Amino acid sequence: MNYARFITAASAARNPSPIRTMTDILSRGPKSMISLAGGLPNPNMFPFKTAVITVENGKTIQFGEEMMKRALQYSPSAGIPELLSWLKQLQIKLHNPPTIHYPPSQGQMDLCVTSGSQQGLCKVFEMIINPGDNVLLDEPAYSGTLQSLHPLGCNIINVASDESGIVPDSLRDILSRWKPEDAKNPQKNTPKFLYTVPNGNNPTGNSLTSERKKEIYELARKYDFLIIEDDPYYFLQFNKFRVPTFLSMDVDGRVIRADSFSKIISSGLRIGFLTGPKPLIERVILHIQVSTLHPSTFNQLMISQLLHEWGEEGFMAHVDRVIDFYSNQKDAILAAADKWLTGLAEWHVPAAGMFLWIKVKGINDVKELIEEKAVKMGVLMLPGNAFYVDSSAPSPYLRASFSSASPEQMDVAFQVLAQLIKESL
Amino acid sequence: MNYARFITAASAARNPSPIRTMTDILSRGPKSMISLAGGLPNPNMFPFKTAVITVENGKTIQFGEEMMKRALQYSPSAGIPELLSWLKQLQIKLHNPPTIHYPPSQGQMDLCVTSGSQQGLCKVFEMIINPGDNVLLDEPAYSGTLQSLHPLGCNIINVASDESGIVPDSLRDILSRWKPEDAKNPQKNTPKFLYTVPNGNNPTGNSLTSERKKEIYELARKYDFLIIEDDPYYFLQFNKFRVPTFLSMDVDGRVIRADSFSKIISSGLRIGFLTGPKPLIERVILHIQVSTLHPSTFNQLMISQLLHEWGEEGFMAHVDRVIDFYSNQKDAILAAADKWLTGLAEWHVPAAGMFLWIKVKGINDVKELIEEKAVKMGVLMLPGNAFYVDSSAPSPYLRASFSSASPEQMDVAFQVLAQLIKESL
């Protein structure tokens, strides 16, 4: 409601730059118009002329001469129109956000293509956080979010989590050190936002429930903080009945949602998307505008034409197939764990994503066992340390990835590991 | 010298955040190593499978099934090794920078592929600028960098320019506000950098001379600021003997260079590069690791395959053909302005780039004439106002691109302009 409180002096001073009133009155003017006003270079000097791109499970993609020229040219900051229209329509279909037909000053839903979903996150973090500000998340927390929040100098307050994600009473009893009304008052510092990964958390594999999601939201107006919903494994959930998202229940316009194509379409293409209240998305767009300018027009055209040829039908069917492959690799890594981990380790089953989070028994830090002993045996896994704010504390946990290894490779891995644990007890 | 000086407290506090040695320890390991430590998704799930791309002037680009999988997957933060080494070799050939074999902790040239050159420029600014800092540039100046700088709270000090770029005596005169030794003394605030576009400035189309570059460099030493060399038209000089770069005289390690592929190879691809002292490039790479993360691996591969069949000869031969193309467009626009505009506008001939900068004669502000009179006659050009820190100040100036228009379009545009200029006197 008071969007000015979630926007820095730096971000607030952004004015609309580039690629301006040029491809604009000449996008609504007569064909006779002549413009010498734009800042675009001649695309005919570019060496690549056509593209053909083969697709498994939908039809091949062709960039003719005219196309290619457009694929190689600058495009709008927030994305190409056809992919913006497709995504927006996708959110409505998927999340039906209460917010789609609010007035803009009031948090009308807006969306922008970013260069990966982590670019719009970083841009959100940058737009919001002053030095000293308090922010809510749950540990263990993705190491990248930890390393992007660090220099912004916020105080990160840890919210207790378990097999089912943030624990509401922990949120509520953290929050009880303020009155719901100091949110109206800048000086002693109510939390600016809560950040979470609701589905298959990196590194835990844990997801929030729908009952917990509504409690967290309630807490969210109550002390009037924003919810950053960083949701890159939303299309990667093992239950094929997906829980509603913070976006689906966002009646107030306090939720910015990051989606990722990286696990389902392409990591290397750098195309992800940001959903939120219109004037905050504006602040990230003014920033994109002086920065990357926009996501590669080539890679958007590819994805948009893939997506339009699929229908949200072929899209959704594509995700069920990739889901299936990730349950089957989950099955395998779990069976490996039961097989070799023994009353030696405890874990929960992953609900989404690609990570197993295993807590090693009566070993109080796992750096030496992995940095030293496992590597020498040809098996690598990831010490839990870097998934905490104080990463110097000992972690008895390992993250093991199941996205790629064959069941044999898991089997050998968990064999070698189980015995290095016992030779350490 | 002392890199600490041009690094924000927030910038110094970034720590490496890579997609890590999960894919480095697993590159010097025995074939039979197994890692469950990696953060990568399974690329076999991505739907596109091969690519065939045509090149006027060259071998067609192919991404077989394997190369495509690497193209869709996450790659290094600073770019793909083949593109980095090819761009590294390129700077060496073109600029021989003093700095290539200096120790890292000194000036030692380093290089980062970025998502456009403007992304790396945005990050250099953010790296350097505390609110209230002094920075030198020459107005008129690209409005994109004006709009990047402004939310940063630097005080921007205008240095005089003319047909040949910054006037070094104006630069000498402004610096006398300080004595060198105050460089050592952070309050008291000596400029932290001078920024310019040395070839074919957006807007004016002027170009620094070699001998001015040399005097500008000594001023930078004396009062010890960085020089930021924004050089996107480096490759578009109409004088085929190329003026030597600031990088090429950078004995001290004080120059940061942006190069752009946007006008020779592709604007829509979002691939450009940033050259400079390793400790300072280090900071921009770390800020990319929480940001875009890396430039589209796919688009980097397309340029790098191309570039590698061309050799540095087929590259320079390509630049040469685009020069000849933008040069006959300069010609033709010069000819349209002689024809129509003599006696009521003044202009220098553009030394590089794609713009003509024209001073109209008996008119204080050119805003209404264009945005109202000329638009209604179906001709657009761009008023100078937005190329100054104070865009509210009246401007007699028009920027006119010659990248695209055909002579006949230039002739009508100049005819219509002429007539409207004298219906306004």
User: Strands A345-346, A355-360: parallel, antiparallel or unpaired by DSSP?
Assistant: antiparallel
Question: Which residue ranges of B are tagged as binding site?
Answer: 20, 74, 142, 202, 399
Q: What is the dihedral of CA A221, A224, A229, A230, to 10 degrees?
A: -160
Tokens representing B114 are 């970025």
Contacts 24+ apart (CB under 8 A), A335-344: A335/A407, A336/A407, A336/A410, A336/A411, A336/A413, A336/A414, A337/A414, A339/A411, A339/A414, A340/A411, A340/A414, A340/A415, A340/A417, A340/A418, A341/A414, A341/A417, A341/A418, A342/A418, A344/A418, A344/A421, A344/A422
Instruction: Give Cα separations from A205 to A23, A157, A345, A348, B25 (angstroms).
Output: 46, 21, 16, 8, 25
CATH no., domain A311-425: 3.90.1150.10
**Which chain B residue is nearest to residue A71, measuring alpha carbons?**
B268
DSSP annotation of A237 reads B
Residue A76 structure tokens: 């709008």
Q: Name the DSSP class of A372.
A: I
For the record, the structure tokens of A72 come out as 């190689």
Residues of B in contact with A59 (CB under 8 A): none
CB atoms B266 and A70 under 8 Å: no
Separation of CA B232 from chain center: 4
Residue B70 CA to residue B48 CA, distance in Å, equals 12
Rounded-to-integer distance, Cα A330 and Cα A355, Å? 8
Contact criterion met (CB below 8 Å) for B332 and B364: no
Give the pair of three-digit tokens for residue B123. 């990050």
Q: CA-CA distance, A232 to A213, in Å (whole number)?
A: 17
Asked whether the beta carbons of A257 and A247 are under 8 A apart, the reply is: yes
Cα–Cα distance measured from residue A313 to residue A102, given in angstroms and rounded to the nearest whole number: 28
Q: Answer yes or no: is A142 a known binding residue.
A: yes
What is the SS3 assignment for A35? strand
Partners of B321 on chain A (C-beta within 8 Å) are 45
On the CB side of B54, how many CA atoms lie within 13 Å of its CA?
11
Strand order across the beta sheet in which A61-63 lies: A61-63, A48-55, B48-55, B61-63
User: Contact B295/A26, CB-based, under 8 Å?
Assistant: no
Supply A269's token pair. 């293409």
Residues of chain B neighbouring A49 (CB-CB closer than 8 A): 54-56
Instruction: Give the SS3 label for residue A266.
Output: coil
What Å distances lie between residue B102 and A319, A355, A372, B258, CA to CA? 51, 43, 35, 20
Residue from A23, A40, A45, A298 whose CB has the most chain B CBs within 10 Å, to mutate: A45
State whether A266 and B25 contact (CB < 8 Å): no
Q: Are the C-beta atoms of residues A258 and A117 closer than 8 Å to each other? A: yes
Q: Is the Cβ pair B400, A36 closer than 8 Å?
A: yes
**Amino acid, res. A193:** F
- Residue A138 DSSP label: -
| Residues of B whose CB is below 8 A from A403 | 38, 40-42
As a whole number of angstroms, the distance between CA B132 and CA B152 comes to 9
Burial of A44 (0-12, 13-18, 19+ CB in 10 A): middle
On whether the CB atoms of residues B381 and B416 are closer than 8 A, the answer is no
Q: Indicate the helix (H) or strand (E) that contains A398.
A: strand A397-401
Q: Nearest chain A residue to B408 by CA: give it.
A: A34
CA dist A382 and A402 (Å) reads: 12
Secondary element (H or E) of residue A229: strand A226-230
Separation CA A371–CA A393 (nearest Å): 16
Q: Which residue in B17, B294, B402 is closest to A144 by CB distance? A: B17
- CA-nearest residue to A43 within chain B is B266
CA dist B340 and A381 (Å) reads 73
Q: How far apart are CA B164 and CA B206, in angstroms?
A: 6
**What residue of A is the nearest CA neighbor of B236?**
A41
Largest CA distance in chain A: 82
Nearest Cα of chain B lies from the Cα of A92 at a distance, in angstroms, of: 24
> Tell me, what amino acid is at A147?
Q
Give the number of other CB atoms < 10 A from CB of residue A237.
Answer: 22
Q: Which residues of B touch A409 (CB under 8 A)?
A: 34
Q: Is A382 in a helix, a strand, or coil?
A: strand
**What is the residue whose two structure tokens read 């875009």?**
B292
**Contact list, A318 vs chain B (CB under 8 Å):** 47
Residues of B in contact with A72 (CB under 8 A): 266-269
To the nearest whole Å, the CA of B176 is away from the closest chain A CA by 31
Domain ranges of chain A: 1-72, 73-310, 311-425
Give the CA dihedral B121, B127, B133, B137, nearest 10 degrees. -20
Which residues of chain B make contact with A65, given a CB cutoff of 8 A? none
Place of tokens 């590819």: A302
Contact B291 A118 (CB under 8 A): yes
Nearest to B292 by CA among B76, B147, B85: B76
For chain A, the 3-state helix, strand and coil shares in percent, each to the nearest 5, are: 40, 15, 40
Question: Could you give the CA distance from residue A227 to residue A191 in angstroms, rounded to a whole number?
Answer: 11
Q: Could you tell me the two tokens for A180?
A: 């719901």
Residue whose token pair is 């970025």:
B114
Look at the block and give the residue holding tokens 């720590």.
Answer: B15
CB contact under 8 A, B39 and A147: no
Give residue numbers after which chain B breaks (C–N above 2.5 Å).
none
Which residues make beta-bridge pairs with B50?
A54
Q: CA nearest A286: which of A128, A127, A151?
A: A127
Query: How many pairs of residues across A and B have Cβ atoms under 8 Å apart?
Result: 313
**Resolution of this structure in Å:** 2.3
Adjacent-strand bridge partners of A62 = A52
**Yes or no, beta carbons of B269 and A322 under 8 Å apart:** no
Using a CB-CB cut-off of 8 Å, the residues of chain A touching B270 are 115, 292-296
Residue type, A179: K
For B36, which of A49, A151, A400 is closest by C-beta distance? Answer: A400
Q: Do A32 and B378 touch (CB under 8 A)?
A: yes
CA pair distance A229, A207, nearest whole angstrom: 12
Q: Does the N-terminal peptide bond of residue B140 adopt cis geometry, omega within 30 degrees of 0?
A: yes
Q: DSSP letter at A421?
A: H
Any residues with CB less than 8 A from the CB of B280 and at least 6 apart, and which? B3, B6, B7, B124, B127, B256
Question: Which residue among B15, B74, B122 sits closest to A291, beta carbon to beta carbon?
Answer: B122
Render A182-222 in DSSP notation, one character per residue.
GGG-GGG----EEEE--SS-TTT-----HHHHHHHHHHHHH
What is the Cα–Cα distance from A296 to B265, expressed in whole angstroms? 14
At B217, phi and psi to the nearest 5?
Answer: -70, -35
Q: Which of B127, B252, B137 is nearest to B191 (CA)?
A: B137
For residue A400, what are its two tokens? 């093991």
Name the residue facing A74 among B48, B268, B375 (closest C-beta): B268
- Give the CA distances from residue B203 to residues B143, B144, B365, in Å, rounded to whole numbers and listed in that order: 9, 11, 17
Q: What is the nearest CA distance from A176 to chain B, expressed in angstroms? A: 31
Measured in angstroms, the CA of A115 and the nearest CA of chain B are apart by 6
| Three-state secondary-structure class, residue A135 | strand
Kindly determine whether residue A269 and residue B49, on different chains, have CB atoms separated by under 8 Å.
no
CA angle B188, B276, A144 (to 5 degrees): 90
* Cα separations in angstroms, B320 against A157, A326, B235: 58, 51, 8
Phi, psi of A113 (to 5 degrees): -75, 135
In sequence order, the 6+-apart residues with CB closer than 8 A to the CB of A4 are: A12
Which of B36, B201, B325 to probe the A interface (max A CBs under 10 A)?
B36
**Half-sphere exposure of residue B270: CA atoms within 13 angstroms, side-chain side:** 29
Four-CA torsion A118, A123, A128, A129, nearest 10 degrees: 70
Task: Please count the other Cβ atoms lying within 10 Å of the Cβ belonging to residue B172.
Answer: 16
Q: State phi, psi for A327 to the nearest 5 degrees.
A: -60, -40
Name the nearest CA neighbour of B382 among B342, B418, B374.
B374
CB atoms within 10 A of CB A288: 26
* Residue A309 CB contacts under 8 Å (≥ 6 apart), including other chains: A55, A58, A59, A61
Q: Which of B34, B122, B154 to mutate to test the interface with A (most CBs of A within 10 A)?
A: B34
Q: Euclidean distance between the first and final Cα of chain A, in Å?
A: 55
Chain length of chain A: 425
Q: Which architecture does CATH list for A73-310?
A: 3-Layer(aba) Sandwich (3.40)
CA distances from A218 to A131, A195, A221, B78, B414 (A): 27, 15, 6, 43, 63
Measured between its terminal Cα atoms, the distance across chain B in Å is 56
Secondary structure string (H, E, C) spanning chain B: CCHHHHCCHHHHHCCCCCCCHHHCHHHCCCCCCEECCCCCCCHHHCCEEEEEEEECCCCCEEECHHHHHHHCCCCCCCCCHHHHHHHHHHHHHHHCCCCCCCCCCCCCEEEEEECCHHHHHHHHHHHHCCCCCEEEECCCCCHHHHHHHHHHCCEEEECCEECCEECHHHHHHHHCCCCHHHHHCCCCCCCCEEEECCCCCCCCCCCCCHHHHHHHHHHHHHCCCEEEEECCCHHHECCCCCCCCCHHHCCCCCEEEEEECCCCCCCCCCCEEEEEEHHHHHHHHHHHCCCCCCCCHHHHHHHHHHHHHHHHHHHHHHHHHHHHHHHHHHHHHHHHHHHHHECCEECCCCCECCEEEEEECCCCCCHHHHHHHHHHCCEECEEHHHHCCCCCCCCCEEEEECCCCCHHHHHHHHHHHHHHHHCCC
- Residue identified by tokens 């050259």 is B275
Judged by CB atoms closer than 8 Å, whether chains meet at B354 and A41 is answered as: yes
Looking up tokens 């993360």, which residue turns up?
B293
Determine whether the interchain pair A33/B379 forms a contact, defined as Cβ–Cβ distance below 8 Å: yes
Question: Tell me, what amino acid is at B332?
Answer: A
**Under an 8 A CB cutoff, do A53 and B48 touch?**
yes
Q: Do B46 and A266 touch (CB under 8 A)?
A: yes
Sign of CA dihedral A369, A373, A379, A385: positive
Q: Say if residues A410 and A332 touch (Cβ distance below 8 Å).
A: yes
CA A109/CA B260 separation, integer angstroms: 35
Calculate how close chain A gets to B193, using CA atoms only, in Å: 19
CA distance B292 to chain A (A): 5
Cis-peptide into B383, omega within 30 deg:
no
CA A157 to CA A171: how far, in whole Å?
10
* Closest residue, chain A, to B287 (C-alpha): A148
Q: Is A202 annotated as a binding residue?
A: yes
Q: Read off the amino acid at residue A240.
A: K
Q: Which two tokens stand for residue B346?
A: 């003044």
* R_g (Cα) of chain B, nearest Å: 23
Cα three-residue angle B6-B7-B12, rounded to 5 degrees: 160
Cα distance between residue B245 and residue A27, in whole Å:
39
Closest CA to A403 of B32, B63, B46: B46
DSSP states of A153-168: TPEEEE--EETTEE-H
Token pair listed for A330: 């989950």
Which residue ranges of B make up the annotated binding site for substrate? 20, 74, 142, 202, 399
| Among B32, B123, B412, beta carbon nearest to A34 | B412
Q: Which residues contact A117 (CB under 8 A, 6 or more apart)?
A: A230, A232, A258, A259, A260, A261, A262, A272, A273, A274
How far apart (Å, rounded) are the C-alpha atoms in residues A303 and B295? 17
Provide the CB-side half-sphere exposure for B229 (13 A, CA).
Answer: 29
Cis amide bond preceding B16, omega within 30 = no
State the best of A113, A152, A291 to mutate against chain B, taking most chain B CBs within 10 Å. Answer: A291
For A405, the closest of B34, B72, B147 (CB atoms) is B34
Asked if the Cβ–Cβ distance from B267 to A52 is below 8 Å, we say no
Method for this entry: X-ray
Distance CA A393, CA A411 (A): 30
| Chain A residues with beta carbon closer than 8 angstroms to that of B382 | 22, 36-38
Q: Reduced to 3 states, what is the DSSP secondary structure of residue A359?
A: strand
Q: What's the DSSP call for residue A405?
A: -
On whether the CB atoms of residues A265 and B47 are closer than 8 A, the answer is yes
List CB contacts of B68: < 8 A, sequence separation 6 or more.
B48, B49, B50, B51
From residue A335, alpha-carbon distances to A249, A327, A330, A410, B186 in Å are: 37, 12, 9, 9, 61
- B8 and B128 in contact (C-beta within 8 Å)? yes
Structure tokens belonging to residue B259:
């190069």
Of A61, A380, A413, the CB nearest to B25: A380
